[PDB]
Each structure stands twice: as C-alpha cells, then as structure tokens.
Design a protein around this ligand. Structure first.
Ligand SMILES: CC(C)n1ncc2cc(C(=O)NCc3coc(-c4cccs4)n3)cnc21
Ligand SMILES: CC(C)n1ncc2cc(C(=O)NCc3coc(-c4cccs4)n3)cnc21
Ligand SMILES: CC(C)n1ncc2cc(C(=O)NCc3coc(-c4cccs4)n3)cnc21
Ligand SMILES: CC(C)n1ncc2cc(C(=O)NCc3coc(-c4cccs4)n3)cnc21
Ligand SMILES: CC(C)n1ncc2cc(C(=O)NCc3coc(-c4cccs4)n3)cnc21
Ligand SMILES: CC(C)n1ncc2cc(C(=O)NCc3coc(-c4cccs4)n3)cnc21
Ligand SMILES: CC(C)n1ncc2cc(C(=O)NCc3coc(-c4cccs4)n3)cnc21
Ligand SMILES: CC(C)n1ncc2cc(C(=O)NCc3coc(-c4cccs4)n3)cnc21
Ligand SMILES: CC(C)n1ncc2cc(C(=O)NCc3coc(-c4cccs4)n3)cnc21
Lengths: 188, 188, 188, 188, 188, 188, 188, 188, 188
C-alpha cells in the first residue's frame, strides 16, 4: 500500500514524503482533524524551507468537517508561498472549498475530475444544547462559507446560496465556467 | 506476506518498492481512495525520476470506485511517460477501464487473464438527497465512461452502452478482439 | 497521513517532530490525558533546549477534560519561555482556555478561526458517590475556571459566569474584542 | 417463574394480581419509571375499589431513580387509604425512602431484613449541560430528601445529612431505633 | 411488572386498562410515535364512550419527539371532554407541554413533582439535506412551541423564549406560579 | 403500551381493534410492507362489513416505501367506501401522498399537524444491476408520483415537480392552500 | 400493527383470519419456507371448506426462494378451486411467477402496481460442492421457470429467456400486454 | 513468529526475505489477491535479478481463489527462469494447480505431503446477477482448469473431469503416479 | 500524538525518552501492571546511569491497582537517588500515594493541580473465594495504606482513616497543609 524510496547521499523516504521534498502535498482522504493537523504542519514546514517557491496541493477528498477545512484554508492564505491546486478523482463538499482556495491563476483540475460544492452537516453535538444559537450557527456558517466562496469564484452571493444548498455535480469544464478552477489540465 | 530486499552500496526495500525502482507499479486490490492516492503518487514520482522512460502497471483488481478510478486515469494521461499495462488474474469493473487506459501500442494481458467491462454502483450517499440530479448523475457518469472507453477500444458508442450495462467475461483473446488490449502476452 | 522528513548531517523526523525542532507544538485533537502528557513533555523539553526563546503552540481542539487542560495550563505558566498561541480552525471548550492562557501580547488567531468558551461536564464518575461534594466540586471548578479566565481576558467575573454557562460562537474579531486573543493574524 | 391462579365464580389471575385482589402490592425490583408507573396505577386502583381499607406494600428493592421514587411517595400520601409497609430481604437507597413513607403506626420489617439510607446519583444527563444548576440541583435534591426523611424518622436534619451522605447497613432493630420502621415483625 | 384484574359479570383487564374503564390514561414513558398513537387512540375511545365526562391524564415523561407531542396535544383540544392533567414524578421537555395543555382549571401536579420546560432537538434527519430550511424549521418550531405555551401559561412571549431556550427545574409551587399548572395537589 | 378493552355481550379487543369496530384505521408508523399489508387487510375487511359507510384513516407517518404506499393508495381508490383522512402530528414523504389520496371533500388535518411532500429514495437494490433502467425507473416513478399528486391537489404538474424534488414543511393552513387537504379541523 | 375482530354468535379473529373466512389469502412479504408453508396450509384449508368457490390471493412480495415459490405454485394448480390473483404495490421476482400462476381469466392487478419478472439467485449452498451439477442446476431451473412462464403468458420461450435474464419494471398495462395478468383492475 | 537475520557487509533481513536472497519463495497460506500480488512481485523480481538461474517455490496452501491462482500460474510460465516446485504439508484446491504448474522435470513433494485436486466455488458475487452467464462461467472455468491440468499431468481430459469434480486425497506416491509431481523427494 | 526528536552525534528519541535522558519520568495514565513495570524499569535504569543525581517523576494519574502502586513505591524508596515528585492536572487514588512517596523536601505540585486521597476497590477476584480472608485483606490493606501515608504526611493515623475512607478533593494549598506535598510550585 505504502512503498519506500531511498537515494545515495542512507535516506529513508516514504512515497508521500519523497513528493513533499519537491513541495508536493497529497490529500486523498476525508478532511478530519487528524489530516488537517498534518496538512497544516506540511504547509508551515514548506514555508520554512522556502517562502518564495510554490507549493503543489493535490486534492481527492469526498468532504469533511467545516472547522477542519477552515484550518487548512486559513493556513494556505496566511503563508507566503503560492499554493497551487490540482483536483483529481473528485473534489466534493469541503474539498471543493479548498479547491477554490488555491492561489489565483494556479487552480487546476484534470479532465475527468468531478466537483461538488455542497457541505451537509455533522458536528451537531456542541450546538444541540441551546436552540436559538444552534439554528443561527448554521446560518452564520452558511454566510461564512457562501461569502468566501463568492469572492474566489468571482460570482454573486445570491447564486452561491442556491447552488450550495442542494447537491451538485460539476465537471472540469463546468467548474472552470463556475470560477472554482482556472484551467482544465490538458494532457502533457 | 511482505518480504524485504536489500543490496550493497545498507538499503532497505520492500518487494513492491524494489519493483518501483525498475519503474514497475503493482496494483492487486480493489480501487479505493487510499490505493488510488498511492498509485497517483507513484506515477508522479516516476515522472520526476525520468519523464522519458516507460512505466509498467500490473493490474489485478476486481473493481472499485469510479471517482477513484478516474484519478488514476487522468494521472496516467497527464504525465509524459508511456504507461504500459499488463493484466494478470483478472481486470473487472474499473480495473478494465485502467486496462484500456494504457499507452496505445502497449496494452497487454496474460493468456488466462479474465476481463469484465461493467461498473455496478456504490457511492450513492451524496446523490441520494436530491432526486432529479441523482438519476442524471448516473446517466452523466454512464455517458462519461462509455465515451472514453469507446475512444480507446476504437468501437462505436452504441455497442459500448449495451456491453457495459450488464455483466461480462472476456478472455485475453476476446479482450484483444474487443480492443481493450493490444496483444496477448505469449510465454517468454 | 503522517509523512517523514530527513536532512543531511541520516536524521529521521516526522512532520510534527520537524516542527518541534523549530519550537512549534501542534495540538489538533481533543484534550485527553494522553495528549496532555505529550504536550507537557514537549513544553518541558523545549525549556531544557532553550529557556529564553519563544514556543509556538498551534491549537485546533474541540475540547477535552478539565484536569487534562489545567495540566497543560500550569506547565505553560510554570516554564520560563513565552508560549505563543495561534488558533486555527476552532478553539472550543478547554481549547479556548489554553487559547487565552498564552503569553500576554502573543495570543493570536486566524481570520476564519472560531472560538467557544464553555466547558460541558464529563468526569462524573469519582464525584457520583457522594452528593454534597459532587455538586460543590462543579461550583468549585466553575469558580476555578471563571476566575482564571477573567484575569486573562481582563473582564469582570460577573460577565464570565453568564457567558461560560451556555454555548458560544465567537469569531476572530469577537474573540479579540472579548480579550481571549490579542490580535487577528492578517495574511502575510 | 410466574404462576397462574383461578377460582370458580373462569377467572384468570396471576400470582401478583391475586394478591392485588386482597389489596397487596408487591415491589421486588429496582425503582425505574416503568415499575413506578405500575405501582402508582395500583395505588390509584385500590383507592377506587375502597378508599377506607388499608393497602399492603411489600418492599424488596436495591434502589432506583429519585424522580421515580417521589412519584410513588406522593401517590401514597395523596390517596386516602393508609398504606402499610413491610420490608423483606432489603430496602436500600430509594427503597428505604418508601419504607419510611408508609402510614404512621404501620411501618414494618422482618427480622433479617437489611436497610440502607443512601441514594447515589444517576440521571446526570439533563443537568450536565449547565454547571451552576447541575451542582445546585444535587443540593436541592439532597435538601429535598433529607427534609422529608427527617420528618418521618422524627430525628434532626443534622443527623440525617451525615448518615445519608455515605453508605449504610441497618438491621431491623437498628432501623426501628432510627425511626425508619415502627416495629420488627416477629414470627406469627 | 404488569398485573391482571378481573371481576364477576369472566372479564380480563390489565391494570392500565382497568384504569381506562374509569377514564384514566396513564403516561409513564418517553413520548415516541408508538405511545403517541396509543394515547390518541385512548382519547378518541373515551370520547366515543362519553363525550361529556372528564378524562384523567397522569403524566410521568422525561420528554420525546415534537411531532409526537403535538399529535397528543391536538387530539386533547379537538375532543369534547375536558382532559384533566396530573403530573407525577417529573414532567420534562414535551411532557411539560402536555402538562400545560390540560383543560383550563384542571391542571394539577403533586408536591414533589418536578417540571422542566425545554425541548432539545432530535429528528434532524429529514431537515439535514437542505440548509436554509433546516435552520428555519427550528425557528418555526420554536415560534410554534413558544406561542402555544405563552397562551396557556398566560405569560408574555418574550419571557417564554428565554426560559424555553436553556434547561429548567421548576417545583410544583414554581410551576403553579409560572402558570403551567393551576393547583398543587395537596394530600387527600 | 397497548391496553385492552372488553364489553358485556366476553369480548377481548385491543385499543386499535376497538377503533376498527367503529371503522377507524390508525396509521402511526413508517410505511413498510408489513404495515401496508395490514392496512390493506383492514380496508378490505371494512368494505366486506359495510360497503356504504365511511372509513376513517388517521395518519402519523414520517414516510416509507413507494411500492408499499401505492398498495394502500390503490386499495383506497378500489373499494366502494369513502375513506376519510385525518392527519395528526406529521404527514411526511409517502404519508402526505396518502393524505391527499383521501376521498374528495373528506381530507382533514389538525391545526399543529405538519406536512412534507417529498419522497427520498431507498429500494435501490433491484435497480442497481442495470444502468439505463435504474435511472429511468426513478424518472418513471417521479412522473408516476407527480401526475397522481397533481390530479388530487388540483394544481399544475410543473409546480409539483419543483416542490416534490426538495424538502418541504407545510402547516395545516399551507397544506389546505396547496390542495393536499380540504379543511383544517377546528377544535370541537 | 395487527388488530382483532370479533362477532356475536365470542369469536376471536385477527384481521388476516377474518379475511380468510371470506376465502381471501393475504401475501405481503418475501416468499420464504415459513410463509410458503402457511400459504399452502390456507389453500388446502379453503379447498376442504369448499372445493367449488373461488379463492382470492392478494400479492405484495418483492421475491423469495424458487423452491418455496413452486410449493405455492403446485398447490394452486393441484386444488380444485379457481385461485384469483390481485397484485398490489409490487410483484417482483417469484411474486410475478405466482401472479401469472392465477386461474386463467382471473389474474388482476391495480393501476399503480409494478411487476418484475426476474429471479436472481440464492440457495447456492447445496449446489456449491459439485461443479458440473451446480451450473446445470441453474440452467435446469432456468428452463423450468421459463417453460412454465411461457405457457401462462402465452408468448414464445425465446422472448421469455431474454426478459427473465435481466431486471424488469412492467406497469399494470405493460404486464397485461405481456400476458402476466388478464385485466387492470379499474376503480369500483 | 517472524524472526530477523543480519550479516556483516548492517543488513536487516526477515527469515522469508533471507530465503528470497537464495531465490526461494515461500507460500504457506490461502491464495487470496494479497498473497498472489506478493508472489507475482517476487517472481518478477527474481527474473530481474537473474533470468537464467532457477527459482524454488515451496507450497503449503489449502486453496484460494481461481483468478488469484491463475495470476501466479501465468506469471510462472511467462518468466524465463525455471520455477521449481516443492510441496510440503498439503497442496489442496488451487495449491495443487500451482503444484503441477512447476517447470517440467522439477516438480517435487515430500513423503508425507498430501495433495487434493478439486476447487470448490466462491466468487459468486459478480456472476449472481445474470443467470445464463453464471452457470456457463462455471463450465468455462471448469473447461479452463481441466484443460490446463490435463496438459501438465499428461492424462486425458475425460479422467480429469471426474477426479476434479469431487474431493480427493492423493499421497506423494499417488500424486507422482497421477503426473502432478515428477518425483517424491527422498531424505537427503 | 507521539513526536520524534533527534540530535547530531543519528539518534532517534521519542519525546518521553528524550526527557528520560534528563532523568525525567512521565506518568500520565492509570496505574496498571504494564505501566508499573515500565516505571520500575526506568527507576532501575536511572540508578544504574547515576546513583547520586536526582530523578524527576511527573504525575497525572486518576488511580490504579494497589499492588501495582506499591511496586512503584517500594522501588522509589529502594534506590539511592532522591526521586522528586511534581503533580500536574490531578493526583487521585493511588496517584496521591506516589505523590506523597516522593523524597522528603522535594514533593511538589502546580497551582491548579487537584489531589484525592482515597482508593476504591477492584482486584476482588482472588479474594472472593474465601470469606474470612477477603474481608480481612481489605482491613490489612487499609492498615497498610493508612500507616505508610501517616508517616509521610506526618499526621496521626486516626485522621488518615477517616479521610481515606470517603472521597476527597484537595487543592495544591490544601495538599500542602495536609502534608502530602512540601511546596506549591509558583510560576518560574
Ligand atoms: C458546522 C455545522 C453547523 N455545519 N456543518 C456543515 C455545515 C454546512 C452548512 C452549510 O451551509 N452548507 C451549505 C454550504 C455552504 O457552503 C457550502 C460549500 C461551499 C463550498 C463547498 S461547500 N455548502 C452550514 N453549517 C454546517
Ligand atoms: C457515480 C455512481 C452513480 N455510479 N456509481 C457506479 C456507477 C456506474 C455507472 C455505470 O456507468 N455503469 C455502467 C458502466 C459504464 O461503464 C462501465 C464500465 C466500463 C468499464 C468498466 S465498467 N460500466 C454509472 N454510475 C455509477
Ligand atoms: C468533573 C467536573 C468538575 N467538570 N468537568 C467539567 C466541568 C466543567 C465545569 C464548568 O465550570 N463548566 C462551565 C464552564 C466553566 O468554565 C468554562 C470554560 C471556560 C473556558 C472554557 S470553558 N466552562 C464544572 N465542572 C466540570
Ligand atoms: C437528581 C440527581 C442529581 N440525583 N440523583 C440521585 C440523587 C441523590 C441525591 C442525594 O441527595 N443523595 C444522598 C441522599 C440523600 O438522601 C438519601 C436518601 C435517604 C433515604 C433514602 S435515599 N440519599 C441527590 N441528587 C440525586
Ligand atoms: C423540529 C426539530 C428540529 N426539533 N426537535 C425538537 C425541537 C425543539 C425546538 C425548540 O424550540 N426547542 C426549545 C423549546 C421551545 O419550547 C420548548 C418547550 C416548552 C415547553 C415544553 S417544550 N422547548 C425546535 N425544534 C425542534
Ligand atoms: C423507485 C425508487 C427508485 N424510489 N424510491 C423512492 C423514490 C422516490 C422518487 C421520487 O420521485 N421522489 C420525489 C417525489 C416525487 O413525488 C414525491 C412525493 C410527493 C408527495 C408525496 S411523495 N416525492 C422516485 N423513485 C423512488
Ligand atoms: C436453484 C437456484 C440456483 N436458483 N435460485 C434462483 C434461481 C433463479 C434462476 C433463474 O432462472 N433466474 C432467472 C429467471 C428465470 O425465470 C425467472 C422468473 C420469471 C418470472 C418470475 S421469476 N427468473 C435459476 N436458478 C435459481
Ligand atoms: C469462477 C467461479 C465460479 N469458480 N470459483 C471456483 C471455481 C471452481 C470451478 C471448478 O471447475 N471446480 C472444479 C475443479 C476443476 O478443476 C479443479 C482443480 C484441479 C486442480 C486444482 S483445482 N477443480 C469452476 N468455477 C469456479
Ligand atoms: C486489596 C484490594 C481489596 N483493594 N483494592 C483497593 C483497595 C483499597 C483499600 C483501601 O484501604 N482503600 C481506602 C484507602 C486507604 O488508603 C487510601 C489511600 C490513601 C492515599 C492514597 S490511596 N485509600 C483496601 N483494599 C483494596
């Protein structure tokens, strides 16, 4: 499942860490607190290595937590390096939020990569105690998500609210037309 | 189950990683997000090692997710190296899609290797909320799969739709006749 | 999930440990006894390495135990180094207590980082035997938490009691206005 | 486990219901909401049958919920009939509360029947959300229990508080001396 | 647990059904769809038996579903008979809603019967698909509950909103002062 | 949970069966094959008892299977008696379909009874084998449901398609305005 | 779920048994050995009651075992009475086999009743030991099913083989056109 | 369970990998996709190391999947090196197929090593959807297995069909007489 | 959860082992046989490294076994080095026994560190066979614990017996006043 790579200078790298040497971060799982903590650590590490060179963030996630996604989001915008974004397989739910969060001019996706811009809700525990706040916290988070998405897609807030309410299935071309990505990555 | 190999120059390789040194990627499991993330990382790694030399992708999968399969597909077509394909045991469901996805002129299969070109459906969660989109997403994905397969097999879209709807069992010779593979790999 | 990093001088670091080399402690999980024991060990370690240089504590926790949180709290205040604090994703329950516990002048949070200053109750086992003490232990702990929070936020004890009783959702700007953090960390 | 009894006038009674015909209620289980609802229904039924004749309540409970116990308590005091009380086996926790709750002059217990006057705490769910109320609700319930017990045992509130805090084991003679029961039921 | 009662005229009644003969409905469990369907059937049955005579509804519920509670509520108001209400043990969450729903002038509670007027939320399934409706459905239901409660308690809507947001613990006297019940049922 | 009722002429009825004697069918559960088989048997039974007198169908269902719902639907329309309909608590998903299916002029609902006219999808097993049919079977069933609903509500097919695609929450007044029910059942 | 019906002459019937008094057999579940044994017992019973009068078999089954289905089939053809057939909800898999097995001229189905004429395979245990027989037993059973179906639908064996291989969804009108049923049962 | 071996030149080998250094592959488990993927990787590795020197394949398997077995089979015949075969303990089901698949003149088995040449059937999932293909796929696979076995044992196809249908237990001498192995490996 | 630390001279340490290099033992879990065996091994190791230099034992345990606690106790007193003690978070049950067991003059605790000096009972298995010994073994162990505690706290045995019978909650100041610790560790 996970192979090893070494070189003469010995030097034990895993396949993901060998890619990290070339400033490539791989994200191929649901966005929980654990993976979010790891992705943030890599982004902070690559900045310390070189603050000028670009970072490559490959995405293949079905979704995850909102608070976990914003941790990755804020880190990407906070650091100096321009974080590139390349969607593969699919970018659904919070994965599409990070897809759009890439550096402007450097948001990519492969031809057969699907996209879905709708976050359903978990994390209902802490809110479920009080009524008035629980309902408003959903609205606040909905306003929080739709505002940030609107700025990056470059579309009106009115259109975002309707699309981000129900389920979606955008292709690479449709995602480019929406403004989520900048270019469909043609072969070679 | 998983043996170790080393050499004098010491240098700990697993059997799969020792094959990766000779640009050989082994795929002998169902295509989920985890293995897809690993296969993509290997394809990106081998390109960085040498963009001209060929890659060998041995396949032995019963199937997997559609979105996971396209992640591997798009990566194979995106990179410069010509990815060879050698089917062993069986190539069913999404495994047969990657079988046909190999570089043109370099798609192989061993004599007693079975082939099956039909993807049943999972991943019904995110779609199950809305009705009109859920049904159409199946049609869109069916049109997505059948179009790409038709191009690589070199057959009409009309024939693909019927064959890829129900179950199939093609031998190495029948798969060659279909256009899925280019040659049956004769002993030695 | 967890990648490796090495360098020539060989030297196997995990991503979290490579950050620990630069005096960065990552906290991206619920605060139980296990993680609390690890965080304390890191704080004691970094003090032994250098008692003058600052420590960076990134927080992304939904909460945890009270006794586990105070173990981290007391350690931060006990050691010489000024422990910086940077909230990412969210800082809820006992996470917000450690958020405010950072060195004065060096308490930060990213723009879209949420904050919640209310600890619900677990650890009901040992108290549940006797009645008079169990109830008073909650009051004592409530007085213990609200007193310490009031000092660091710089607000009255009367206001803290009401806010820390029910659920809350403070943004980076609201948390700064409350006195929990000192500055909202602007990009670059 | 549960036998049947009938008579000529046919008339299917279970052993517990045949005793209910002679105004005898059997209580030989932990006091949950289900049994409490049944005991109250029997007390209300026997009152409707005859409001003057006495009721016999045999007790053999290790304990139960506080709110469930008070439902039986209030019902016993509300109805007209003088509810006799006969402890057998043991009367622990809330069982001893109902033991003392019997009609004055008609509280009994057999020679080898144990008694324990201490309620530990469950039902921590609804209280666990808010801190100040949860602790005070224990004190309120402690004041509620100790006040009512003090009136019926005919001892001071100061003595009750100490005894009802920790575990106890009173024999029939000691329970009579305490004031929980009125007489030890001698053979024949 | 459940005894039998018969009489000469033979005639097999359970203890709950024997009470139903005297127009007494017992409610000593959480208010789900099953018990709600049974309670409604009893209310409709007693109306058919006699539309003029009063019905007695004993309550001992920790809570339940909102939609299940309104089914009992609407049925009580729809039928001709004046449904009396007698709280025992506790009336928490939706139980307190039905407690107040009793006929005006005939709402009772025993001395040590607790009351709690706050419904937390379940039934989050059907709403969780769409965002804008899910949050507003909580507000609509909150407006639905608080409006109806305000009319029956005879207090302002402003006071109800605050009390029904967080947890509560009202005694028989406090519940009478609130307007939830009309009289505390004194012994005999 | 389920009480007994008898009378002198002895005659053991359960509460639901006693209502069935007065031509009242209670439906307070999800519509599966088991309850559907029972409801149909009752409808066929009441027709045999008297084909002229009206039947009363009380509804309190969150939903169920489509094929199970149509079994009840077709039976109601097939038999001679005019089946009245009274919604209580809620009528969601397939429950609202049967709500509208009542005899014309005799479709009722209580004041606080909610309504929801959207069927999500299960029963995906038998369809999941073939692709072209599975998607079209959803469209056929959608056309099947929307056509029948449109006739009974008396609105256009265009409006039904949009409303029955996403989630809904109609009150008694809104359901009356929609045409699902004929009158809101006022007290007494 | 299951109500009771009695009458004066006392006489305890369940709703299904009351229908059995009027020669109506209800089938609303998957066809296993247990229900098959019960259905056969009813068919044999109704013959003994009256061998001339017709029997009414209401069907609402998703499918079941082949051997269990043939037990009901053979019994229907063996007995003298003409067994009517009325499909409700759906008649899938082996249910459609019994649907067509009804007396000629008396095979019915309601307007919105679905039909599916394809049996997938279970009961693989006893066959799985030997290879040559296991495969041929499927062919023998396929020849057994298709031959009998062809006779009753009145179509060719060639057409049956293709339709009964893959999944199907026939409406009442299409099932009538196929020859499975004789008439669509119009309202009243 | 699994020991370590190293040598001076340091060099960490597991016991299985140390044998792989001397071109020995150990197979002591059921033949699933995982072990098949590993065995193939070793065969491909040893060919790359030296295409002329022989490989030693020790077998001790009770059986496994057919498709998994053919993956190992085809690989053995495809590569240049003559793969020796030494049966130990037992070679049942698909293990006996690989036993016979060894290089001609180099098929061995120890004195007390049992042999069984019959594959029962699993992998019934993908076939179970369609009837005509499922049965024929068993026949095709039976023809596939019996044809290949007949060639290597050097016996008629008629004899193989009967023996490979039911269970078998051949000793080392009987297996040699059958043609499965070439020689019984005498001590030293 | 557990990070790595290395240095140039390479040298793989875990965070806990890096602290062990500076004679710091971390105890942040319940005291079972496994952790007790590890703690003893560390104490024996640090003595062998240097018998004169002090050892630092950080405690954060809720409790554990008695026999496991005495194993650590006896080891601390047996070895030459003066084992310092620093309580963090909490020191409950057997943790408080080891808290007091520290070298005289070197027993510490942080400001918000709680303390509880009462061991409840497990390990009831081996004793439960014989009656007279089981009860006396509790008394012997109670005399064993209370005697040793009394010596180190420097208080009477009479006071210890009462306090160590029921539950306790001592703060850092109260624990210092009790004699359990020597000083409250002030910041810096
Ligand atoms: C924390 C908890 C309360 N929670 N959890 C999930 C969740 C979702 C929403 C919500 O409004 N989801 C719709 C939505 C907004 O924005 C996007 C997306 C844009 C881009 C990708 S998704 N979808 C609101 N609160 C939510
Ligand atoms: C996304 C979800 C709706 N989903 N999930 C599975 C799945 C399958 C199909 C589908 O196209 N099934 C038929 C088909 C096409 O192409 C192939 C194959 C070619 C080659 C191998 S399989 N089979 C369509 N949607 C699917
Ligand atoms: C075991 C038992 C003693 N226990 N466990 C948890 C817990 C919590 C409280 C309590 O005071 N909860 C409310 C509160 C105070 O202060 C804060 C917070 C400030 C800052 C973040 S949370 N919330 C009281 N007893 C508790
Ligand atoms: C409401 C919930 C938090 N709860 N649940 C149980 C419980 C018990 C007490 C309590 O005071 N327990 C000690 C006690 C007093 O008096 C008796 C008894 C005397 C005689 C019989 S019982 N025991 C306080 N709150 C409790
Ligand atoms: C429909 C679903 C989302 N749901 N489920 C429960 C629930 C509760 C509320 C709510 O308003 N809860 C607070 C409240 C108001 O009024 C009362 C009560 C007073 C008296 C008795 S209860 N509690 C809102 N939506 C809810
Ligand atoms: C057969 C299987 C695939 N299946 N299962 C459920 C299901 C639902 C639909 C569908 O059209 N759902 C939306 C809808 C239309 O009309 C109503 C309703 C109005 C009123 C009550 S329900 N909802 C289509 N296929 C479905
Ligand atoms: C004995 C065991 C191996 N088994 N179990 C199920 C089963 C099904 C078949 C088969 O032929 N299935 C397809 C088929 C033919 O005809 C119908 C039907 C028409 C109408 C109703 S069913 N479906 C063959 N063997 C089967
Ligand atoms: C594809 C799936 C349906 N499947 N799975 C197992 C399996 C087995 C057979 C079969 O022919 N089994 C008998 C047999 C023939 O030859 C040998 C052997 C000789 C020697 C070793 S095995 N056994 C046919 N289909 C099978
Ligand atoms: C051997 C087995 C039956 N067992 N297991 C636990 C246990 C506890 C005791 C006992 O005496 N518990 C009370 C106590 C005394 O002293 C302390 C403590 C002071 C300080 C720390 S603990 N608690 C007696 N036997 C026990």
């Amino acid at each position: 499942l996970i192979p090893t790579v070494i070189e003469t200078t010995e030097r034990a790298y895993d396949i993901y860490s060998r890619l990290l040497k070339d400033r490539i971060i791989m994200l191929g799982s649901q966005i929980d607190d654990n993976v979010a903590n790891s992705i943030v650590s890599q982004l902070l590490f690559l900045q310390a290595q070189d603050s000028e060179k670009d970072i490559y963030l490959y995405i293949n996630s079905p979704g995850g937590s909102v608070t976990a996604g914003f941790a990755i989001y804020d880190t990407i915008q906070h650091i100096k390096p321009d974080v590139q974004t390349i969607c593969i397989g699919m970018a659904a739910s919070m994965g599409s939020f990070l897809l759009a969060a890439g550096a402007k001019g450097k948001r990519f996706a492969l031809p057969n990569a699907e996209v879905m811009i709708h976050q359903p809700l978990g994390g209902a525990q802490g809110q479920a105690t009080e009524i008035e706040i629980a309902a408003n916290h959903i609205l606040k988070t909905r306003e929080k998500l739709n505002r940030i998405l609107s700025e990056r897609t470059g579309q009106s807030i009115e259109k975002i609210q309707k699309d981000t309410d129900r389920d979606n299935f955008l292709t690479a071309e449709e995602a480019k037309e929406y403004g989520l990505i900048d270019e469909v990555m043609v072969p070679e």
